Every structure is written in structure tokens, then in C-alpha cells.
């Protein structure tokens, strides 16, 4: 009796999982010949190459534990196998006699990488693999053939393109294993009965005082479930349009899917699929690039331009990216890491950050904008580098593109406008409800200068209990001065790329 494998790596969830179908129809297809292993790896290499926030580690193990819960209800269960990929795979495809190994593409550069090593042993020993596209709607690959071996750089063209590709069939739920036994025990699982179990939390976040708010649930289930939630008003979904929600609303002002997209514990294509639903319905309604399915192109236009570009996630040697002098402030660095930068709106952003894991988009935009072009002329790397230790959807792709529109490095380059970090949060939130929250100490500034505490007199200071440089910092740079003085480099640096 041989196994059969399903690798989880993204992909966390049984539904539209093509390439976790496949493996289950094939046993039920032909009962009595195969064993199921649907495993995840608890790889430490990944360790060396990403950043992983408290946060983000409980949202994983959540993932795992609902993943593992999902499928005994098909007559399985979770193998979280620890170990690196290289030596975990010739020993299972061994001691399980693995037939066939199924998993869903990735395009980061640590993906392919360990997923062609993973098929060149799987060719070695015999073990057929079927990998399937299924983290995105459209496959990347033939976005940039379509569009003759380039990644269209600008979202039109890209939209112009998916237009006249085929959507995917959406799947189901796998049919529940038919009379299938739990596979025999091997060498690791005989010495120890949970060598495979699901972590506890305990095993996963080592640093459980940086655990914030436990907001949003990781695992498939709460991900269909905040979907449905967010499709339930038909009128706010239809007339989405993505400038006009607030970065400063107490509660998320989007539908806060990205954890559960990024990790796959929802399928785009299924969201895109109900998203079309609704649209259908609803005739008056919002186009691309303002609409929530505009939002889900916006991350199918980043992971192709991605998938073209090993060296997405840096300046140098990124075909795309501006190459840009930033210098190296260690100081403001970590005031700006610590929302300790005396701006309010910014350091409520920062802190909002650090303590849930999740900030909106333009939220992301202003502290974004503040770190790099800006006001601190610090590389974009460096933010991106904060934001993925500390973002639940933290995501490769889209963490860099981002990064890079932001700090007019690609994508953008109308680096004249400006945030501004005191006006920029008070057309949404003019009484600073926002700052309140996430920067207490300033509780008591009234709305007039609550965005410039240093408006206020000391003897206000005083009495509002939050003296500037005792209780708040000090502002570590004047935006006034700075922001100007950065629009000029930046022109400089733009001369300087367009010369050679
Ligand atoms: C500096 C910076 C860093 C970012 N890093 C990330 C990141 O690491 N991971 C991440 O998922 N998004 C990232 N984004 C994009 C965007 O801000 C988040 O996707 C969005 O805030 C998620 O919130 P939401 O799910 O409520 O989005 P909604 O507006 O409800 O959109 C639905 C989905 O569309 C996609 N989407 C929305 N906006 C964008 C966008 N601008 N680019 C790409 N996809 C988008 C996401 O999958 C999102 O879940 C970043 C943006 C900036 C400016």
C-alpha cells in the first residue's frame, strides 16, 4: 500500500483545492490502495529568509489547528512533519511509499527554489508530482506569455490582458475519505505518538508578550466566515470604492480578508467568484481599480510583475525599481518602528500596527510615505522588513510592490504629492477618536491640535497630563522642512536613472 501527499504550504484550506481534490478522489476512486497524507512542514529555513511577529506566528498556528480540525471531518488529518524540505521529503517518500505528491504553486524565489529541488528528488524516486495554480486567479506565467515575455507594468494594461484569459472552475469541498485506515505509524511516529500533531501555541510563539489583540482568527473557517459577513450588504460591496474608505475608522473600514488570502485560507478565485455574484445583481456599482474586485487585480497585477522578478523585494538588482541613494538613520529608524516619531497620526498607525497586525491600506500609505520619499529618506527595504515581521498578511509580493509604489521607487512616480502627517488623518477623523486610542497618552489634546500636540502651550501640556519630550516624544524631524528637501532628491535620483 502506497501514500499519496498533499503538501500545504499556502493553499491552507480544503476548498477550491485542486490539487487536495485530486489526491482525495484518486483514494476514494480506488479504495484499498492508498494511504492520504496531507502534511505541512514546519520548515526552520524559512526562518533565516523572513521575519515572523508574534502575531503572525498565533494566526499560523490557528490556521493549523482548523486546518487539522477541517479535514478529520473528511476522515483525515493535519501531519505538521518538522524538518527542512530537503531532508524530510527522501525520508517520507521512503518510509511511506509515496506514490504521488500534489501542492499549489508559489512564485516567491524561496518557493521555487525548494519546490524544484522537492521535483528533482520526487523525479529521482519515482513519485509523480502535480502542482496546481490556485493561490492566484490567473496564472502569472501566462500573464507575461500573453503579453509576449514582459509582465505588463501598469494596472491597465494588466487588466487589458486578464480580460482574455479563462477564469478557473471554482471547486468544492473534498468528498469525505471512503473506509480509508489511519496510516501505519512510521520511525518518527512510533517513538513519540504527536511527532506530527498541530504546534500549541506554546511551540510556535516564543514571545508571548508581544501577542496582541486576538482580532482575527486565523484557519479557513473564519475566513468563509468574514466573507460571508462582508458580502451580506450587497449596496456597500457593489459601490466599494477603495480611496473613500477611511484609514482611521476605529473599526476596519475593508473587509480585513488579507491574512486569510494570504495564507490561502481563502481561495481569490472563490471571493472573486461570489464578488461577481453580487456585481451581477447589483447594476449600479464600482469598476477597477476602486472596486473590491479591483482590489483582488490589484494583487493579481503584483504577483506577476513579481514572478518576473527574483529580486522583487530589494533596490538592487530589481529590473523594475528605481535605484534611489537612501540613507541610514538607525535612530529615526526605530522611532518610526516604535511609532515613537512625535507625529500622532503616524505613531497611532505604528502602534496600531505593532499591537494588531493588520492597518489600512492608506494607513499603510501614510507611514509608508513617511519612512522613505517622504520625511526620513529611509530605504524602502527597511519598511518593508518592519511591516513583515508585523503584518498578518504579510506577502511577498505584495509587501515589496507596495513598498515601491509608495516610495515612487516603481509603479509611481508623481513623487510631488506628499502626505502630509498631520492633515492627511483629519479630513477621515477630524476629532483624532483614532489617535486617542492607539497613542493614550495624548487622550486628553483636544481636536484642535490633538494632530500637533506640539501646537499646544506647556502649561496645556501640563494640564493635559502628556508633556512633549516627558510622556510623547518630540517631533524627530520638521515635515515642513524635510519633505521639501526630499522632493529634490528625489528629482535628483530620477535624473540620475533616466541617464543611464
Ligand atoms: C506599504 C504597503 C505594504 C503592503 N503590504 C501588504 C502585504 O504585505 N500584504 C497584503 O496583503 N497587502 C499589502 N498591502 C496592500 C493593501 O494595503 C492590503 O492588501 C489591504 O490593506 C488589505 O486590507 P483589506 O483586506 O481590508 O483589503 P480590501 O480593500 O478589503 O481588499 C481585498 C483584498 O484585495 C487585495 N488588495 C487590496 N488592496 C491591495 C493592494 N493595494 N495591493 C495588492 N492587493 C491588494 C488583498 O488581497 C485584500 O485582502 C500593502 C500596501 C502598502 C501601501
Same mark, same amino acid.
Given at each position: 500500500r502506497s501514500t499519496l501527499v498533499h503538501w500545504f504550504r499556502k493553499g491552507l484550506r480544503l476548498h477550491d483545492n485542486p490539487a487536495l481534490s485530486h489526491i482525495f478522489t484518486a483514494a476514494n476512486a480506488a479504495p484499498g490502495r492508498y494511504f492520504v497524507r496531507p502534511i505541512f512542514i514546519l520548515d526552520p529555513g524559512i526562518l533565516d529568509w523572513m521575519q515572523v511577529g508574534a502575531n503572525r506566528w498565533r494566526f499560523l498556528q490557528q490556521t493549523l489547528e482548523d486546518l487539522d480540525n477541517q479535514l478529520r471531518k473528511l476522515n483525515s488529518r493535519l501531519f505538521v512533519v518538522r524538518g527542512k524540505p530537503a531532508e524530510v521529503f527522501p525520508r517520507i517518500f521512503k518510509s511511506w511509499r509515496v506514490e504521488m505528491l500534489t501542492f499549489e504553486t508559489d512564485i516567491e524565489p524561496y518557493s521555487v527554489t525548494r519546490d524544484a529541488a522537492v521535483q528533482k528528488l520526487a523525479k529521482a524516486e519515482g513519485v509523480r508530482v502535480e502542482t496546481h495554480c490556485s493561490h492566484t486567479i490567473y496564472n502569472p506565467e501566462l500573464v507575461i506569455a500573453k503579453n509576449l515575455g514582459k509582465a505588463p507594468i501598469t494596472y491597465q494594461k494588466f487588466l487589458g490582458i486578464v480580460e482574455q484569459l479563462k477564469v478557473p472552475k471554482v471547486l468544492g469541498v473534498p468528498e469525505k475519505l471512503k473506509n480509508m485506515p489511519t496510516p501505519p505509524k512510521d520511525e518518527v511516529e512510533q517513538k513519540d505518538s504527536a511527532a506530527y500533531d498541530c504546534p500549541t501555541m506554546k511551540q510556535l510563539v516564543k514571545?508571548?508578550?508581544?501577542?496582541?489583540?486576538?482580532?482575527f482568527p486565523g484557519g479557513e473557517t473564519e475566513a468563509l466566515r468574514r466573507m460571508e459577513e462582508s458580502l451580506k450588504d450587497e449596496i456597500w460591496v457593489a459601490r466599494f470604492e477603495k480611496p473613500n474608505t477611511a484609514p482611521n475608522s476605529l473599526e476596519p473600514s475593508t473587509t480585513v480578508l488579507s491574512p486569510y488570502l494570504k495564507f490561502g485560507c481563502l481561495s481569490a478565485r472563490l471571493f472573486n467568484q461570489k464578488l461577481k455574484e453580487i456585481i451581477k445583481r447589483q447594476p449600479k456599482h464600482s469598476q477597477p481599480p476602486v472596486s473590491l474586485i479591483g482590489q483582488l487585480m490589484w494583487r493579481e497585477f503584483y504577483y506577476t510583475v513579481a514572478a518576473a522578478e527574483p529580486n522583487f523585494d530589494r533596490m538592487l538588482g530589481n529590473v523594475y525599481c528605481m535605484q534611489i541613494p537612501w540613507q541610514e538613520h538607525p535612530d529615526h529608524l526605530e522611532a518610526w518602528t516604535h511609532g515613537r516619531t512625535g507625529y500622532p497620526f503616524i505613531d497611532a498607525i505604528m502602534r496600531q500596527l505593532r499591537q494588531e497586525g493588520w492597518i489600512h491600506h492608506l494607513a499603510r500609505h501614510a507611514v509608508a510615505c513617511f519612512l522613505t520619499?517622504?520625511?526620513?529618506?529611509?530605504?524602502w527595504e527597511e519598511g518593508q522588513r518592519v511591516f513583515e515581521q508585523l503584518?498578518? %498578511?504579510?506577502?511577498w509580493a505584495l509587501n515589496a510592490g507596495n513598498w515601491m509604489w509608495l516610495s515612487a521607487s516603481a509603479f509611481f512616480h508623481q513623487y510631488f504629492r506628499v502626505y502630509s502627517p498631520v492633515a492627511?488623518?483629519?479630513?477621515? %477623523?477630524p476629532q483624532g477618536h483614532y489617535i486617542r486610542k492607539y497613542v493614550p497618552e495624548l487622550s486628553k489634546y483636544p481636536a484642535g491640535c490633538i494632530y500637533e500636540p506640539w501646537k499646544a502651550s506647556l502649561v496645556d501640556q501640563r494640564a493635559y497630563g502628556c508633556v512633549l519630550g516627558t510622556d510623547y516624544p518630540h517631533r524627530i524631524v520638521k515635515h515642513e522642512v524635510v519633505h521639501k528637501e526630499n522632493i529634490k532628491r528625489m528629482g535628483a535620483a530620477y535624473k540620475v536613472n533616466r541617464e543611464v
Amino acid at each position: 500500500r502506497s501514500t499519496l501527499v498533499h503538501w500545504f504550504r499556502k493553499g491552507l484550506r480544503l476548498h477550491d483545492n485542486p490539487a487536495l481534490s485530486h489526491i482525495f478522489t484518486a483514494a476514494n476512486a480506488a479504495p484499498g490502495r492508498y494511504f492520504v497524507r496531507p502534511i505541512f512542514i514546519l520548515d526552520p529555513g524559512i526562518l533565516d529568509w523572513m521575519q515572523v511577529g508574534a502575531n503572525r506566528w498565533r494566526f499560523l498556528q490557528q490556521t493549523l489547528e482548523d486546518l487539522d480540525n477541517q479535514l478529520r471531518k473528511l476522515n483525515s488529518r493535519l501531519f505538521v512533519v518538522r524538518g527542512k524540505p530537503a531532508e524530510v521529503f527522501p525520508r517520507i517518500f521512503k518510509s511511506w511509499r509515496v506514490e504521488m505528491l500534489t501542492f499549489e504553486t508559489d512564485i516567491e524565489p524561496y518557493s521555487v527554489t525548494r519546490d524544484a529541488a522537492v521535483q528533482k528528488l520526487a523525479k529521482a524516486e519515482g513519485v509523480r508530482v502535480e502542482t496546481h495554480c490556485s493561490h492566484t486567479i490567473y496564472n502569472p506565467e501566462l500573464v507575461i506569455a500573453k503579453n509576449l515575455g514582459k509582465a505588463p507594468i501598469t494596472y491597465q494594461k494588466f487588466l487589458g490582458i486578464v480580460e482574455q484569459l479563462k477564469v478557473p472552475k471554482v471547486l468544492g469541498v473534498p468528498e469525505k475519505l471512503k473506509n480509508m485506515p489511519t496510516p501505519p505509524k512510521d520511525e518518527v511516529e512510533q517513538k513519540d505518538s504527536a511527532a506530527y500533531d498541530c504546534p500549541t501555541m506554546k511551540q510556535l510563539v516564543k514571545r508571548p508578550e508581544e501577542l496582541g489583540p486576538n482580532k482575527f482568527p486565523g484557519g479557513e473557517t473564519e475566513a468563509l466566515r468574514r466573507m460571508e459577513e462582508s458580502l451580506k450588504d450587497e449596496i456597500w460591496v457593489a459601490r466599494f470604492e477603495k480611496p473613500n474608505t477611511a484609514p482611521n475608522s476605529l473599526e476596519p473600514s475593508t473587509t480585513v480578508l488579507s491574512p486569510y488570502l494570504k495564507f490561502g485560507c481563502l481561495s481569490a478565485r472563490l471571493f472573486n467568484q461570489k464578488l461577481k455574484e453580487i456585481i451581477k445583481r447589483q447594476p449600479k456599482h464600482s469598476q477597477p481599480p476602486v472596486s473590491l474586485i479591483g482590489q483582488l487585480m490589484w494583487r493579481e497585477f503584483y504577483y506577476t510583475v513579481a514572478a518576473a522578478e527574483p529580486n522583487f523585494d530589494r533596490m538592487l538588482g530589481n529590473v523594475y525599481c528605481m535605484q534611489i541613494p537612501w540613507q541610514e538613520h538607525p535612530d529615526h529608524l526605530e522611532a518610526w518602528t516604535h511609532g515613537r516619531t512625535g507625529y500622532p497620526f503616524i505613531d497611532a498607525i505604528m502602534r496600531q500596527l505593532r499591537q494588531e497586525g493588520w492597518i489600512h491600506h492608506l494607513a499603510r500609505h501614510a507611514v509608508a510615505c513617511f519612512l522613505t520619499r517622504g520625511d526620513l529618506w529611509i530605504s524602502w527595504e527597511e519598511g518593508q522588513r518592519v511591516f513583515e515581521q508585523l503584518l498578518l %498578511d504579510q506577502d511577498w509580493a505584495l509587501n515589496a510592490g507596495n513598498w515601491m509604489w509608495l516610495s515612487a521607487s516603481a509603479f509611481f512616480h508623481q513623487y510631488f504629492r506628499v502626505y502630509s502627517p498631520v492633515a492627511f488623518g483629519k479630513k477621515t %477623523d477630524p476629532q483624532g477618536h483614532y489617535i486617542r486610542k492607539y497613542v493614550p497618552e495624548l487622550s486628553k489634546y483636544p481636536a484642535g491640535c490633538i494632530y500637533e500636540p506640539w501646537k499646544a502651550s506647556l502649561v496645556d501640556q501640563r494640564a493635559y497630563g502628556c508633556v512633549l519630550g516627558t510622556d510623547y516624544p518630540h517631533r524627530i524631524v520638521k515635515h515642513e522642512v524635510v519633505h521639501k528637501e526630499n522632493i529634490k532628491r528625489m528629482g535628483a535620483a530620477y535624473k540620475v536613472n533616466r541617464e543611464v
